[PDB]
């Protein structure tokens, strides 16, 4: 719901990742939040969707990767709801998008849509199969520990949880 996009700027965090398998609702929520007529915080109607390919580089672009497709301002007025939804859903490996959100609060949030499935592991030796198949950056795994090792660290719906993004798949058989 539009609540979900407005919540993104409720805290000091302004960097998020959404799975492309949720592209329909994502776009729904973004348009819903910018079409809000009565909420205390409303998303501006300037939401910009830029597309990149990670497997080809360009140091001049903000992400450092060569841009692909067309830069879109997603609004119901611009009628580009279907191009963005279908492009996101049909992203191939290595292609992604940065959606830049601006609010009437004058706040900004960045959402990254990656061609990735969502999977939840519940825990140990469990880490073995995770590390055999995928490769991670240590700073990410370190920061994960830095949040687990804080007094502020709380449970999410009866569960302590952290979210990890592998850089890619590890070569197996060697």
């Amino acid at each position: 719901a539009a609540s979900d996009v407005i919540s993104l700027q409720d805290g000091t965090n302004d960097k998020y990742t959404v799975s492309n398998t949720k592209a329909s609702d994502l776009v729904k929520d973004i348009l819903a939040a910018q079409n809000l007529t009565t909420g205390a915080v409303i998303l501006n109607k300037d939401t910009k969707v830029t597309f990149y390919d990670a497997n080809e580089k360009d140091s001049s672009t903000p992400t450092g990767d060569k841009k692909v497709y067309s830069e879109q301002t997603l609004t119901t007025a611009n009628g580009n709801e279907d191009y963005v939804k279908t492009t996101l859903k049909n992203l191939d490996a290595g292609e992604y998008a940065i959606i830049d959100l601006t609010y009437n609060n004058a706040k900004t949030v960045e959402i990254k849509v990656v061609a990735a499935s969502e999977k939840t592991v519940v825990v140990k030796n469990s880490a073995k199969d995770i590390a055999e198949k995928y490769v991670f950056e240590d700073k990410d795994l370190e920061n994960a520990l830095k949040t687990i090792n804080a007094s502020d660290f709380s449970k999410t719906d009866s569960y302590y949880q952290v979210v990890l993004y592998p850089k890619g798949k590890r070569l197996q058989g060697f």
Partner: protein
């Protein structure tokens, strides 16, 4: 629609959510994941089905493969012009060949007695960049051992490759070691002494001997010189004239206990030199191994100061520590299993790394020694050499290395 809490990677295959009721179970899962993730850049295993193949694996890793870097984080030599060759069943002949391999910028390879192995002949061609299109010139193979260790047939085949061959050998362990030491020379006014039965003691010190020092004792892997090792009988009263004329007036450190080198021999060397002899001793292989590590790889030593400058060039002498480590067998069950540490010695000199000798268990002295010399801020590295070292040992060393 989950709005996950961070920026991902372009090639992120899956968005993993690790969850648990217990903060402890989640803590260990992510901790173990960090360690198992770094193990692919932390640990290496250079091993083969036998001694001959293992030495080839070390040559493939550090010589003419990826090039030389200024951090000393890649190859010992990229343009290799020399090779040191030893008999695979003749450890006693090549015992002190590691500092020779260091001075000659050469891999140390192993061959069979009678006829050169095709495996090794291919390796020599590889590391020396021998091709049938160019004249084979300026390329030398130094054989450490006698005709009973490396045959005459090996030499004639090495000569059919266009290679120059130089043998270093004598009538026994001690003459051969003296011939090798005489090639290296006393540019650092020092020599290391070991006993004829102190095979594990020579393997512990090979690392330190192969470390190229400059004139002031700083570590110069560019214009520096290694230190020779000499084998002595022990349980004997006099030194030969050859050893006397070699040693002259140079500093001497005897590695090993009094069963390896007697007090009588210690005083003999003392008198010929006219100087005091140092002794790094222990009661066993692993005790002498620990003592070598504690002594020569301590924080105040030059090896530690140079080893941190390879991790970060702007590091102070207060950051000194050891960051690279090697582990091989100790040869308690079978003494010839020490030959896996002979090939690595010169490499440990370049990488500024001790060699831990342990097959089935890591002694308590070794554990304390590693904890006292290991670095603090930067990452650590562990290379296992050979097959057959117990997982007990590797995990223990990894714990000590913050790994």
């Amino acid at each position: 629609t989950n709005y996950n809490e961070g920026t991902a990677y372009g090639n992120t295959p899956v968005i993993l959510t690790l969850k648990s009721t217990s903060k402890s179970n989640l803590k260990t899962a992510v901790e173990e994941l960090q360690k198992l993730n770094a193990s692919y850049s932390n640990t290496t295993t250079l091993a083969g089905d036998d001694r001959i193949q293992t030495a080839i694996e070390i040559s493939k890793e550090y010589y003419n493969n990826d090039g030389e870097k200024s951090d000393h984080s890649a190859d010992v030599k990229e343009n290799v012009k020399n090779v040191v060759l030893v008999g695979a069943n003749a450890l006693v002949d090549g015992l002190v060949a590691a500092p020779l391999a260091a001075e000659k910028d050469a891999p140390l390879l192993l061959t069979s007695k009678d006829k050169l192995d095709s495996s090794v002949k291919s390796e020599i061609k590889r590391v020396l960049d021998l091709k049938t299109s160019t004249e084979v010139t300026g390329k030398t193979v130094y054989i450490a051992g006698g005709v009973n260790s490396v045959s005459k047939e090996v030499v004639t085949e090495l000569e059919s490759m266009g290679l120059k061959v130089e043998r270093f050998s004598g009538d026994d362990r001690y003459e051969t070691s003296l011939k090798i030491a005489d090639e290296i020379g006393l540019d650092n006014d020092k020599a290391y002494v070991v006993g004829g039965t102190g095979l594990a003691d020579a393997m512990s010190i090979a690392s330190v001997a192969s470390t190229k020092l400059d004139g002031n004792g700083v570590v110069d892997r560019t214009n520096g010189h290694a230190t020779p090792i000499v084998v002595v009988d022990g349980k004997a009263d006099k030194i030969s004239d050859d050893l006397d004329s070699f040693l002259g007036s140079a500093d001497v450190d005897i590695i090993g206990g009094f069963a390896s080198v007697s007090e009588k021999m210690e005083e003999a060397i003392s008198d010929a030199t006219g100087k005091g002899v140092t002794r790094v001793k222990g009661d066993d292989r692993q005790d002498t191994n620990s003592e070598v590590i504690k002594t020569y790889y301590a924080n105040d030593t030059e090896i530690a100061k140079a080893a941190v400058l390879d991790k970060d060039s702007g590091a102070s002498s207060s950051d000194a520590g050891v960051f690279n480590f090697y582990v091989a067998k100790d040869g308690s069950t079978k003494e010839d299993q020490l030959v896996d540490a002979l090939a690595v010695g010169a490499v440990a000199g370049y990488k500024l790394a001790p060699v831990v000798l342990a097959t089935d268990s890591l002694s308590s002295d070794q554990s304390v020694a590693i904890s006292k010399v290991v670095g603090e801020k930067y990452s650590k590295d562990l290379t296992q050499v050979g097959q057959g070292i117990a997982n007990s040992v590797i995990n223990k060393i990894k714990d000590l290395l913050d790994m």
